[PDB]
Design a protein around this ligand. Structure first.
Ligand SMILES: OC[C@@H](O)[C@H](O)[C@@H](O)CO
Length: 422
DNA sequence: AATCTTTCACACGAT
DNA sequence: TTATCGTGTGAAAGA
C-alpha cells in the first residue's frame, strides 16, 4: 500500500529540500503561421530540470539496476492539442533543452493555448505532463501607438522580457541577451528573462532600488536584471527604433514584439549593442537633418517580448511511489479568513485534489478541498510549534507545503506567520 | 474616406 | 543558375 508522510520524514525534507523541479520558460504571445509558413516561437520555449532531486533520483534508479539510458529524463513538447506531433527534447548532459521549431498554424482556432511537456525516464517510468502558462495567439504586431487599454500587450514594471537581435530577417542570425560566464552575452542557443524595472528619472546608479509601478513607455529609464543570476545592466533609457534610427521623442507604451534600443543613461549617445557573442556600447550618429533621431548600429536594435515561467516542484517524501507525480499542484496565493470560530487559511491555485493535505512546518492540517483552484485548511494552534505557549509570544514563521496521500511533497514558496497580539 | 486588424503574398538573404 | 526556408513588409480583404 502507499505510506502517508510521517512527521519524521517531513522534518527530514525541510532540512534538505532536495526537490525535483521542472521549469517551462516561454514567451507570453506567439505569432500565427498562415498557409504553409512556419513562424517559430521566439524565444524558443525552454524546459529546465532544477534541484538536487534529479541527481538523487538517478542514483536511486541506478542502485536498483538501471543503466544511464534507463535513468535519463526524457521530454517531448507540443502545443496544447494537435495535429502536431510533439517534438523530442534532448536533456542528455545538460539540464535544459529549447524547442527551436514550434509554431502554430492559422488552422488552429484557439485564441490562447499552453505548451504541454510530457516527461518520463528512459526505462518508460512515467514522470508526467507539465503545462506552460497561457500564451496569446496574435496575427501580427500592431503598427499603431499602443493604448493602455490593450493592457494585454503592454509591459508592466517588474515583469520579465526577453530581448533578441536578428540581422537580416535571417533565422540563423538570431541572438538573445543571456548572462553566462560572468558577463552579458548574445547567445544563439539560450536566452535570459530580465526583469524590467521602471525607475524615476532622478534615480542614480547601483544596487539600490526604488520600485515604480506602471507600464513601460519609450523615453523612460529602466533597469534590466537577469531573473536567474541577478546581474544588472547600467541604467538604460528604452527608445523606439524605426529603420536604422532611434527616436528620441517617442513616449508611447512599449508593446510585444516592438523593436527598441537601449541608450546607456548619462553617456554620449552610447547604446547597448551586440557584436557576435559580445555585448558592447556603440555610439549613435546624429542626423543633422532631424534633431529628434539618431542613427544606430544594426546590433543595437532589439526585439522585446514578455516572458513567463511555469514552475513545478515535487519530492518523494516516502520514497518511490506507484503513481506519477503530475498534475503538480501550484499555490498562487494564501489568505487568512479569519474568519468565524476557528482560523482558516484559503489557498488559491491549480491542480488541487481531495488527496492533498496542507502541512504547516511538520504539522499536517485538517484540509478541505473545494475545487481544483481552492482549498481551505484549519490553522494549527501555536502550541503545535511552541509547546506550552498559550498565546503567540513572539512571531513564528512556518513553511506551507502540500502533500499527497502517498507522501509526495509539493513545496510552495509561501510561509505562514503567527504574530503576537498588539 | 480613412483606419485598424487579419490574412495573403512575395522579396530578402540565408542554405 | 534555380529551389526552398524563416522572416519582414506591404497589399488585400474584412470589420
Ligand atoms: O533572393 C531572391 C532570389 O532571386 C529568389 O530566389 C527569391 O528572391 C527568393 O524568394
Amino acid at each position: 500500500p502507499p505510506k502517508r508522510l510521517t512527521r519524521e520524514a517531513m522534518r527530514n525534507y525541510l532540512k534538505e529540500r532536495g526537490d525535483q523541479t521542472v521549469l517551462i520558460l516561454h514567451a507570453k504571445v506567439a505569432q500565427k503561421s498562415y498557409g504553409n509558413e512556419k513562424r517559430f516561437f521566439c524565444p524558443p520555449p525552454c524546459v529546465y530540470l532544477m534541484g538536487s532531486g534529479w541527481k538523487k533520483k538517478k542514483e536511486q534508479m541506478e542502485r536498483d539496476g538501471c543503466s544511464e539510458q534507463e535513468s535519463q529524463p526524457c521530454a517531448f513538447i507540443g502545443i496544447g492539442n494537435s495535429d502536431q506531433e510533439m517534438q523530442q527534447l534532448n536533456l542528455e548532459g545538460k539540464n535544459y533543452c529549447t524547442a527551436k521549431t514550434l509554431y502554430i498554424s492559422d488552422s488552429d482556432k484557439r485564441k490562447h493555448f499552453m505548451l504541454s511537456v510530457k516527461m518520463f525516464y528512459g526505462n518508460s517510468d512515467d514522470i508526467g505532463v507539465f503545462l506552460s502558462k497561457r500564451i496569446k495567439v496574435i496575427s501580427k504586431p500592431s503598427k499603431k501607438k499602443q493604448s493602455l487599454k490593450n493592457a494585454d500587450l503592454c509591459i508592466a514594471s517588474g515583469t520579465k522580457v526577453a530581448l533578441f537581435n536578428r540581422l537580416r530577417s535571417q533565422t540563423v542570425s538570431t541572438r538573445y541577451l543571456h548572462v553566462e560566464g560572468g558577463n552579458f552575452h548574445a547567445s544563439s542557443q539560450q536566452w535570459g528573462a530580465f526583469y524590467i524595472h521602471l525607475l524615476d528619472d532622478d534615480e542614480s546608479e547601483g544596487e539600490e532600488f526604488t520600485v515604480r509601478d506602471g507600464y513601460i513607455h519609450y523615453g523612460q529609464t529602466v533597469k534590466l536584471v537577469c531573473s536567474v543570476t541577478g546581474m544588472a545592466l547600467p541604467r538604460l533609457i528604452i527608445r523606439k527604433v524605426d529603420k536604422q534610427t532611434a527616436l528620441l521623442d517617442a513616449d508611447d507604451p512599449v508593446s510585444q514584439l516592438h523593436k527598441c534600443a537601449f541608450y546607456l543613461k548619462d553617456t554620449e549617445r552610447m547604446y547597448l549593442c551586440l557584436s557576435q557573442e559580445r555585448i558592447i556600447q556603440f555610439q549613435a550618429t546624429p542626423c543633422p537633418k532631424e534633431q529628434n533621431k539618431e542613427m544606430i548600429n544594426d546590433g543595437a536594435s532589439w526585439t522585446i517580448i514578455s516572458t513567463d515561467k511555469a514552475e513545478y516542484t515535487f519530492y518523494e517524501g516516502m520514497g518511490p511511489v506507484l503513481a506519477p507525480v503530475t498534475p503538480v499542484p501550484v499555490v498562487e496565493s494564501l489568505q487568512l479568513n479569519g474568519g468565524g470560530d476557528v482560523a482558516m487559511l484559503e489557498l488559491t491555485g491549480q491542480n488541487f485534489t481531495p488527496n492533498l493535505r496542507v502541512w504547516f512546518g511538520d504539522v499536517e492540517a485538517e484540509t478541505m478541498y473545494r475545487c481544483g483552484e481552492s482549498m481551505l485548511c484549519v490553522v494549527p494552534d501555536i502550541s503545535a510549534f511552541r509547546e506550552g505557549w498559550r498565546w503567540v509570544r513572539q512571531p513564528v514563521q512556518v513553511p506551507v507545503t502540500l502533500v499527497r496521500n502517498d507522501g509526495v511533497i509539493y513545496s510552495t514558496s509561501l510561509t505562514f506567520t503567527y504574530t503576537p497580539e498588539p
